[PDB]
Amino acid sequence: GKKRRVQVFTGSMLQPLYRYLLSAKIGVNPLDLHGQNIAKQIFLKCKQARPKYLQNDFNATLVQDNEAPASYFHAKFVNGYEQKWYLHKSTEEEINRNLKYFNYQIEMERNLQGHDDEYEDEETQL
Amino acid sequence: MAEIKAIINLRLLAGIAKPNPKMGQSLGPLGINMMHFCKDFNAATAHIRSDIPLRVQVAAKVDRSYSYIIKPPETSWLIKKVIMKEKLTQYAGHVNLDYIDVRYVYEIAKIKKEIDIDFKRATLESICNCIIGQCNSMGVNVSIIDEKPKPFNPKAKV
Amino acid sequence: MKIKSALKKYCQHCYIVKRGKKVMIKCKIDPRHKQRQG
Amino acid sequence: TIVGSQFDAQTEHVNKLALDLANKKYRKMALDQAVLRKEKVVVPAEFRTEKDSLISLKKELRSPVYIKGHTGIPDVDLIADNRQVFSIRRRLQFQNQSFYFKVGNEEFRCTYDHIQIHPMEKWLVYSKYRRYVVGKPNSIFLPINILPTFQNNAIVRGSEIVQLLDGIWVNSYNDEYPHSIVIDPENLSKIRPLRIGDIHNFLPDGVEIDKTKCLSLHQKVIKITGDKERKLDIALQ
Amino acid sequence: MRFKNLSNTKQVSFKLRNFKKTTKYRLVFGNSMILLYKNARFESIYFELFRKYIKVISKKKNININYRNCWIFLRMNTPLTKKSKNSRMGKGKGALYRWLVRLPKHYKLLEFKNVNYYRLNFLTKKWSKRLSLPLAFVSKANL
Amino acid sequence: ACQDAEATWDASRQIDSIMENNKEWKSIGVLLQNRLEFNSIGLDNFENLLLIDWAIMPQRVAIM
Amino acid sequence: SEDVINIWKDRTDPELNPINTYPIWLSHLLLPQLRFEQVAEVYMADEDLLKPHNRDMKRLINQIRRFGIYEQNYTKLAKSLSLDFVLPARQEKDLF
Amino acid sequence: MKRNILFIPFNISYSYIEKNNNTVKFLYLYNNDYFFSINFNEKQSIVINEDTNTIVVETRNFNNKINLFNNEFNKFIYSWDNFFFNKIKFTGKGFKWKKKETNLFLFFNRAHKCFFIGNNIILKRLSKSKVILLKNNYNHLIHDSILVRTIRSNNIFTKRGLRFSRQIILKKKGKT
Amino acid sequence: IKSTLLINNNYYFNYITNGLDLKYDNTFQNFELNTLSIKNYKNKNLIISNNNQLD
RNA sequence: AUCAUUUUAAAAAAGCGUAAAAGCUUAAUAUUAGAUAAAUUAAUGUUAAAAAUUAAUUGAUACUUAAAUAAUCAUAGAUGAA
Ligand SMILES: [Mg+2]
């Protein structure tokens, strides 16, 4: 047909979720039924996803811990932050806004240090 | 880096891989050394006759790295050898004139299975049925023949 | 902009917006696709 | 396919059920194209009046109905719901199936003849039918449906059957009449095609041909071509 | 007019100041058809614009059909005379510049035999938008 | 005379019941699968007339 | 080099043999691999002679997953194709 | 149904209260400094997780304004003991600035003065081609950040001029 | 019939994107070695086996 | 020409894209969570079964055929709403 000539760039507004992570540790009870599968999917998005938008030292794992109270998603960020989120009651959507509540701040911490943690504009167009 | 920038299909002679300028149009802008490349190709294909044209793929990467992979020759070329013709029908289905017998199909399928990575899961009926549909598109049929053919070296673009 | 009584969508990206009695089309790719109804 | 090949090889023997089943349906249909199913259908409805005009009904989503009668019989015109009418189409058997209409204690047989729809608006205008009575002639449409035969030698290879007529118009004089016609064209050839009189000779006693509608018994339905290679060799040479 | 001697004789016909007729449509030859839905003066260019697009449908390369697809029955009926510019009234009737077809309400313009249902609906909508007339498409399926 | 019945006829319909109410079937079945190694199948319908208790194929083998 | 299939310089040419020498599944190739379409006509007549082997069912199903996608992609074409252009036809193409 | 989600930060601690009559339902947020309450109709049902500090809402009333109710509620709480942030850049030859105590001096090929003066913001320079703004309200920020943008913005032909650090940029060929 | 008779169940699942990372090392994933009891009966990623280690 | 295979599924492709290549998206599809599938009519009195029920409607959702109703826009002249 016709050739586009206006190039709309959307690389700088790209904000993936697992990008400021250094590690991860899935925890599973075989007695959960809602807290197992939620952690199944996260472990894929940590490895099935793309490595550009992750750190270089990102290592995700999975362990079956019968001793735990509930299946968990432990995580560790760059600048020191560390948390755990049990999964017998939650959703995959309630988790992501927590990750934004960290990832939105680490920018406010690292930009002040001078670090450009942003992407080129030419990475993804519309 | 390890991310895949591009994939290219090629066609090469086994032991006469050489920096032909008619392959630098594809591998030139990617910064790949044709000389250092063709070395690792000819090294592997020393157990293969040099007259034969193969094909290869190249997952060219973002850092202009490469990882070459080898596949069997073109399935059509192999049949033109047995059939002793160079050019096949314009039409297909309507114009059916060529003939092979099964006893070579059972032998050229092993070629694909022994080498090609895609068919490692596959059986031989599966592979043999793949080419018959490729034969329907070409003017070819599968009919019993007692005789053998005599040698022929049909062309390839290289 | 160009006033088309009969509006029309050229590319899939074109979409409609209504500001009161006002109607128009806009595109995120080709800013020449946009229109108004008058 | 849906299971890996490595497991299918272990269960390649299982697929006899696949092919042994398709024997059953396609043979059953192929021999049941001819016969009306023995199942009574009924349509509750209401009489006509001069009050119920079209557009009055058509907001109520009812429909008019019309019946044409036969020798000595009067016509009948009725009212009914649209969704009854489309459901009557939605059977296989719509071209010929006998449908009743219960107004009260009365029942009126019929057949489908056709329907008219308002094309620009695309709602149902009327549903027209044809009366059926047992002891008197009655117009019906017997479609022709040709079976495949791998028993003839010319039909198998490079020849083409040609069905010039889709059906036949007849007159039936009895309760149960055949849905359609089924043919086994083995004995046919290029030399003789089938002709309507070859059908007229083979029908029940209650059926006759409506000569008012057809042209001549010497008319022909199924025609067979010659070979293709015998043309193709001559075409090139 | 008079059909006896078309080319030889000079022809005149009364304009018909209010002429309306409806003719009950029904298919005879084939399966699907197009039919008009309004009294109208059907020109010739209303046909010749979308004449090729029917051939691309009904006829195709390297395919032979014994039976017939299209049945047309259109013929001209109205001369449509007119006066010059600076001419007073009276002193006779005007002269010719065109010919047309006066069609009734329910007129089978076309009758088709096993032609693609999906394209004729795409055609007749575009047909009717150029012409701005109401036209319909009918098939034995929907009926 | 048997045409209509054979159309809908299937022997595999019995499976979901026998899988429940036959311990003789499973306990030896456990041995076939877990411990030792063959191309076991399980309930395999013999031309839509029987269902063999345990079988191996293509060898046309039966363990009833 | 008087070689018919030999890619490997080391190997020799596998020589022909009687057809009985080979596995059975070559025999299922010489027969005309039907569509699922003609195969029903076979079942309409119950021709005991022509009937599919077991492996035929998988290939027939892969005609059928692939024919459904042929219609869905046609119906879009028939409805959205400019009248200037042409459709592919669904009938035979008698040449000459 | 769309089941909207209410985030709560970690610094905040909350409670949920009802009558014995059960005809009234309301909720109470409480921090070291502030405190804030808001009710829920009889037609809004609610779910809570301490695991995530998130609350879920259904609405039998089918009011579409709730999607705005969220963003106010969410940002009004994160507006306590946290900033919002933004970053600005430029690329060009005869361009510069100078910074003196939340009073930014802009020189982008214009005859007139171009002072920017911030009432109750924070502005801290990280490089010649980069500056961050910080403030607790997001809506004043953009009005504060965009005034800088309107002096020069991205040319659609070259990415020369100012821009935000996260934005949709347009480009068009020119002088091949 | 296999799913009921299994004892030492070992639920597995993929984290594959595409085989390009494996094809371009001339590798691939085998299933002839340990032709397992089950592959993708309901969950089209799950695999079940007896072997506590499965490479 | 429209075959065939591997796949849980994936068109000798319904389209954009290339000097030709490459690259992008739909159809078809999976994992996880949320989540629609609700109301009925007519038949052989009671004996088959480690087992199997026909013809048919209305309605919620998506695809699809499409039409109708209602409002809004569809530029206006020359002494001044007109
Ligand atoms: Mg393909």
Ligand SMILES: [Zn+2]
């Ligand atoms: Zn647009």
